[PDB]
Amino acid sequence: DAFRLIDTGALINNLEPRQTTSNTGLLNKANIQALIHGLNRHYYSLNIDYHKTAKETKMLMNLHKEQWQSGLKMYDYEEKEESNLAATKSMVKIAEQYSKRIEEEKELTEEELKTRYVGRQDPKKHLSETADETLENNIVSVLTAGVNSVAIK
Amino acid sequence: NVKDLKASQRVCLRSDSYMLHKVLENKADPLVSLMMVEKVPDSTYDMVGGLTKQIKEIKEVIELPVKHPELFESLGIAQPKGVILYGPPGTGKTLLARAVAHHTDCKFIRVSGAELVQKYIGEGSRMVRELFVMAREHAPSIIFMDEIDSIGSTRVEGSGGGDSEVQRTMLELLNQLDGFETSKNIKIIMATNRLDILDPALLRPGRIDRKIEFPPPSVAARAEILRIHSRKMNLTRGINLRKVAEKMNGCSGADVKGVCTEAGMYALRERRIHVTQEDFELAVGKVMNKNQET
Amino acid sequence: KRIQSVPLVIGQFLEPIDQNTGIVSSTTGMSYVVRILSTLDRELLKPSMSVALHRHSNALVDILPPDSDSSISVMGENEKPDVTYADVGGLDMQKQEIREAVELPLVQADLYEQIGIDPPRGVLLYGPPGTGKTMLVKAVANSTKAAFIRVNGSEFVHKYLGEGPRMVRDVFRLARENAPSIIFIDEVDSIATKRFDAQTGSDREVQRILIELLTQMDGFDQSTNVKVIMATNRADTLDPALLRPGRLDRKIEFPSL
Amino acid sequence: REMFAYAKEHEPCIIFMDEVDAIGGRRFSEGTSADREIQRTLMELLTQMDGFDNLGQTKIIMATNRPDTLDPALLRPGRLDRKVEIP
Amino acid sequence: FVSNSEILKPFEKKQEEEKKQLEEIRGNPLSIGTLEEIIDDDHAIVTSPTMPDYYVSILSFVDKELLEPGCSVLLHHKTMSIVGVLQDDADPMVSVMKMDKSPTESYSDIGGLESQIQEIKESVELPLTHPELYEEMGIKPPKGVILYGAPGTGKTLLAKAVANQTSATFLRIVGSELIQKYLGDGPRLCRQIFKVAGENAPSIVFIDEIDAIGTKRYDSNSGGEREIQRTMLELLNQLDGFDDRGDVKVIMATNKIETLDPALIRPGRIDRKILFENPDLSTKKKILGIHTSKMNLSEDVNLETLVTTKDDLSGADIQAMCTEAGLLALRERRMQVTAEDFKQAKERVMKNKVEENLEGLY
Amino acid sequence: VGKAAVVKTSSRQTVFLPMVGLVDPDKLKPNDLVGVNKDSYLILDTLPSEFDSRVKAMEVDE
Amino acid sequence: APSHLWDIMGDRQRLGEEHPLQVARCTKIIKKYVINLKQIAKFVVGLGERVSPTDIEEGMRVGVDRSKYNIELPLPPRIDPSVTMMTVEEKPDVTYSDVGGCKDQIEKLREVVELPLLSPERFATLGIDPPKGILLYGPPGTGKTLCARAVANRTDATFIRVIGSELVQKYVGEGARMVRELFEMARTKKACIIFFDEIDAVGGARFDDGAGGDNEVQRTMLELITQLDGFDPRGNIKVMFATNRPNTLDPALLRPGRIDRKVEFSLPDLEGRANIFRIHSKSMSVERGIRWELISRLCPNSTGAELRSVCTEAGMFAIRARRKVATEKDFLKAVDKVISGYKKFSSTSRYMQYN
Amino acid sequence: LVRDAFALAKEKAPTIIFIDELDAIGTKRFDSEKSGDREVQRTMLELLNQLDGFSSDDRVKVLAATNRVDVLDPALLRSGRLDRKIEFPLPSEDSRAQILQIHSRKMTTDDDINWQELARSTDEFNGAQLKAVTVEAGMIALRNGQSSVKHEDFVEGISEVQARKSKSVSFYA
């Protein structure tokens, strides 16, 4: 947050709402929500934007985008699997129970064509929770098979 | 707008500018520490046996004018203030008060002495009359004084102390409803072990217009009490319900269920879901020893 | 989903209000009204369930697993296999009522369902000061090898007032979640009283501990697994509301003389 | 709870109590005048001796003007096993 | 036209401008507090329930005459200024408990005391309703009356009918609520009762069933022997510690005033002693006729027979026989109550509790 | 291990701080009231020749 | 009405931050000021812009700023006293001449109280010490408080009303604070009057055994004696002890060093009771030619409370007996009413003296 | 309070502590009803612990002033707390004569007063009852308009009822 002194904001001083993104303060919510309209003094009209040059653009892409994987290659694949060796066999088995235990609870509401247990949001609970679980199993299946694959005798 | 706003309403207060947003919910019925108010209780006449002779008495005395307020008003009889039922303690006479509020669609309210002593500024004397003022908002229900008698799960069968002071204090306020509101919606039902618990002041019981005697437990009285709770499992008709009640000496209504517990105690050691004639003789022998012990 | 991550605030659910909107109680002592994250649901939580809150806004984020403080958290077995019931004899008069109100429901809970008799939820120990014990009560958990929770009467009151009632709900909850347990409370007479409660008043309220002991006792004790044992002294003053059959049943006095 | 917690790391040694006339009372309720905080002090002392933690190495020296003011629960065996008179 | 434009128009416009200036005072940044003391410099210290300390100035619309220590003023969140004086926040919540406006009572149910009714009227009803009586003659009206007699004579109903004629607030006090044992607290509650009666000045002060502790007679709230000194002398310190010419009139009533402290009687404030007696057979027909007005009586039932049977009975005993005789016919579902129910009611209610002296003939 | 002092604020909050060069370990005493910062809560001011305070009623009359 | 006469100044003394100071008490003075907040927090600050070095004293509330702590304006000490702030009255009712008759009770009190306040230089010639305390007990109903209020009118200063039940509070030890609140305003407000009402509920010697919970009453007087005569004989204003139970008081309370002048009210004689009906003859209605000396002679010795009841009840006979004004016949009926009719209780008449 | 009272005896070692009304703090209160109080004996245990602590260097000497000896804690007297028990009986003839003479030094008399006769006129009077003699002696000459206080004003000022005088009791004879 920056600050710009408006001096006398009574009548005919200058037009702040021109440059970029002005006329904020909808209802009582602005930033911390305690400032609302008047903000600090005579509506200093906070606006801040960033920029990147040609050198700063290639620097961030080669350093930090989401996580830093650069500088070394096959270690990030193996070390993630090696530390998880006892965990992967466990996580596949542990999440195997919790996957069906959710399917064995909310899914039983909708069975026949008519209404029995009066399912409402129950059939949609086990669908969204187990949607990523079936995806994570396919991801670790390729990673576990891919690292040991690709040559290395 | 403020037209829809009133007291005892939980609302949403904004955390930024400190302003009102909307109304969330109301204030719950229980207040302070523990407030027990039961509307339309689960106590019925079919669950209480052996009092049928007494149930018919309290039906035309207590329940009758409360369920039909237009009777005594048209016939010229003043509204009954309160009715007390005296008898042997431990028989569960409180369940009779809960049964009246069930059929009359009233609320069962207990007056506890633990909340009569509290830390407040100026409200120390209010807690005595607070349950009387709040009862106007609880609809024309029936107030029962808690901890004035021993049903077998409680203590202090009775005393001539502050327990009897609060009784005549709330009953004195019944004349105030006729002086100000000119309508009395409050009726208090009480139960004591002896007649000496009451305070002989204000000559004649003007506060309690009906004194009902509670019959002591007998063979025919405990026979219907047992049969209600006696069967959780298979039973036989060869055993006599009066023979089981004859073995019990002075056992109250709460002690009858002790035979029901002992009926399944011997069946649990044998892992049998049926009760034969040999178990009835062993069940009554244990209860007679437990009643005389401690 | 990864925005909040580690910096979460411990809290506890209270009452539902609106869809994906509920009121909670933060450990800081300030109750805020916030919303519920879209990935969760009001049906996925419980009134005593603990949830995670935001640092500043204190918004509900994630549902905490069934674990809490409960003073010193005990898994139920710590150096338990030491003493047995044979170390203290002559208790056959007292132990006969204990085994029927503790040992039998802890092993086979279906026997009470077949007899249709309500098993006693709580257990009390009477007698004048100096009763000894601290042996057979531990011996039951030692012989049956079940979970055991010991919380003294002075440990229910946290240094902060609002944390007091939040910790009491956690004592009864952690026992039912994982395995059948046994709740032991030594000298609870400092809370349960007869009409002298809070010594004719103290501090601000102080009654928040007794309210949760009465309310949470009826909510739990259903599957007939966890039992409550409370040993006290003789003040000749006791709470009759606790003694009601709808809350506590088993009452055992030490065989004095 | 402190003195018995520090007894494990600082070695059992000896813990001393100096002229305690207060916590050993029955304290009938007149309103107690804020002294209810002392009632939980007596409860903590009683539950400590009967606690499941390892004890007996740490010595508790409690001196007082007269013994009767002390808690009769403490005077009975199981907590205070040693009464040494200095006549 | 000319006057309405220069009066009504600027008035409605000024009131809207005053509310706009309240946004910086009464606006959303608003809080409360408890006033402690005031200083001649237009500054005061006020403590909110969160226990802060705010030293600020005084705003408009309020002077220092309305600001008293112990009250609750209005504060601000940011500027923290004192806005104005306000009443008790959420109020004491005392509306109708022992006090009311105009209770409904007549002179028929209290009939039979007419010999002693003219004493309380001239000393209470006459000076309050007609103040010109003692002002024109210069006499001083009685500042209180004492009530003594057997219960059941309508002790409370006596002053209840007088309150309806005076059209003023009628205060009452329970004897057992002042002696309540918390810690001390006996004299503290007594001051709060008379303090409320001084602000509005109802000019009526009554106490029903003075008890305190004669000997014990309590369990939960005792107070010990020190409570007797701090309670009974506190009611004395109200009349003895203040001189009020024409406003506060203190009336005391109980079953027996003899065992009370002669200092508690406070002679010279109460110049009238009223004794209570049971109504005679001539006045029983007025009370009996009211309860039996809506009752269906048979042809063999005579009102003069029930009055003759009654011997040494209170006013509640007249309606008791009508209630007992009415329930006997109600259980049998009868329209007109038979004469047998009236005979069984007058005989049973006569002797129930104590039938005999238990020893000798006395 | 290293020399470090632990302070307990008057608001009942425990703050850990490394040894400050403005004070000495011999001058620092346990369970003592010393001047601390409002923000960093570091130990700066020393003991002003008074253990705690005179509470309410005290007579300094000579 | 004065809406705009204030907000004009709202742009200086309000918008700016000066007044919002955190009230706190200073402890140690190093000449560094150690000040303890009401939140239980301690700090050290210096002087202010307008703060004088001699204004800050030990044991005094000093307001400090909330953001950056600094001394700005001093505050009066003892902000905790609350109930005692209502004990100050002004312009009482009973005047100096309202006391019936002129007796020794009036002349002895005005010399030890009214004389040193009005004429402080009269006793300075002989160089003596005026009595600090006085004694008024007597039997009740004699108008004891009526004579005490006659002195407060001639004084025209602050009158402190102290009730005997005010010393006993709802907290143990708070009674000792209530005593210091009375003597603290004596130094703040000079030449005032304090009056105790029914000290029997506090003042007394209960010894030890027989109760076990009554020791809170005796600890109030031991603090009251210390605040009266302590190690340092600090006192200015006169002290008045009044109660209706002189025999049950502390046997040391009646000793010199606190109370010097001892004046006990007595039952007025025929000459004393004569002026009681004369001061009341100016009020109500009195028939011309009636001699009140014969009415007071028929009335035996009794308290002054029953004497004023005769003239009050005399006007009540005119309504029932159908009379215009108060005659001699109605005066004789008041003798059989106010006296002979009330002979059952409703009086002391040598009842409470010792036991 | 007691803990910080002797704390000021550390920074300043040669100090003097005074305790007024020693009987104000103490009791037993165990057997009988009310279970005592315990809001008092707390500060009494501080007096026992502090004097047995770093104190008792004989720079901490405390002056204990109390009324009677009847009600007190028997544990308050020890060689480490209070040693010399100083009894203060009523002054004798020659003791009252010197006390009465000092209080009259600020007054104006004719120097005809012989205090040896007034010392025998005073029978068993304490230090406070002697000071009230010179106070009332000045009030007698003030109401009568006397320029000086003669010997008769002292005799008249001492004489007052109090005691058992003005007996309504029977017997006598």
Side-chain angles (χ1 to χ4, degrees), chain B residues 149-214:
Chain B
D149 187 5
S150 178
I151 60 172
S153 64
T154 60
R155 298 289 183 269
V156 182
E157 294 178 351
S159 63
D163 290 344
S164 296
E165 296 301 321
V166 178
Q167 295 178 336
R168 65 182 181 89
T169 300
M170 293 178 181
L171 295 174
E172 183 178 2
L173 297 175
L174 296 175
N175 291 337
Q176 185 176 356
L177 296 175
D178 291 344
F180 181 80
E181 292 297 320
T182 62
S183 178
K184 180 180 75 180
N185 291 337
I186 295 170
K187 183 178 179 180
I188 295 171
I189 303 301
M190 294 182 286
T192 58
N193 61 344
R194 300 290 182 268
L195 296 175
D196 291 344
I197 304 301
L198 296 175
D199 291 344
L202 194 146
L203 296 175
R204 185 66 62 186
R207 301 290 182 268
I208 296 170
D209 291 344
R210 296 287 294 173
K211 293 177 179 177
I212 295 171
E213 182 178 2
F214 178 80

Side-chain angles (χ1 to χ4, degrees), chain B residues 217-227 229-231 235-252 255-263 275-288 291:
Chain B
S218 63
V219 176
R222 292 192 298 273
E224 294 178 351
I225 297 171
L226 177 63
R227 182 177 181 172
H229 300 290
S230 65
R231 183 182 296 275
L235 294 176
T236 187
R237 294 182 182 175
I239 189 65
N240 189 341
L241 296 175
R242 294 182 182 175
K243 183 178 179 180
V244 176
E246 183 178 2
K247 302 299 183 181
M248 293 184 286
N249 189 340
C251 295
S252 64
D255 291 344
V256 176
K257 291 189 295 184
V259 177
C260 298
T261 300
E262 295 301 321
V275 175
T276 59
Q277 294 178 336
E278 294 177 351
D279 291 344
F280 295 99
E281 294 178 351
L282 296 175
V284 296
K286 179 62 174 172
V287 176
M288 293 184 287
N291 190 30

Side-chain angles (χ1 to χ4, degrees), chain H residues 66-85:
Chain H
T66 188
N67 290 336
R68 58 178 182 182
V69 297
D70 291 344
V71 176
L72 59 81
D73 186 5
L76 294 174
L77 276 67
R78 185 178 180 172
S79 62
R81 291 191 295 274
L82 296 174
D83 291 348
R84 182 58 58 86
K85 184 181 68 64

Side-chain angles (χ1 to χ4, degrees), chain E residues 43 47 51 53 55 59-60 122 137-138 140 183 191 226 234 237 240-243 267 271-273, chain G residues 2 6 19 22-23 38-39 93 145 149 165 170 197 206 214 283-284 305 309 312-313 320 342 344:
Chain E
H43 295 83
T47 299
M51 299 301 293
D53 289 341
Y55 176 79
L59 294 174
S60 297
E122 295 177 351
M137 294 177 182
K140 293 181 181 298
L183 179 61
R191 294 182 182 175
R226 301 290 179 268
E234 183 67 14
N237 291 336
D240 181 66
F242 296 97
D243 186 5
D271 291 344
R272 183 65 64 184
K273 185 186 293 179
Chain G
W6 291 93
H19 302 291
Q22 184 64 57
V23 176
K38 186 177 180 180
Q39 295 300 321
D93 290 344
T145 58
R149 294 183 180 276
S165 64
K170 62 182 178 181
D197 186 5
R206 300 290 182 268
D214 291 345
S283 178
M284 64 175 284
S309 296
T312 299
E313 183 67 15
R320 292 192 297 273
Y342 295 144
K344 301 302 287 185

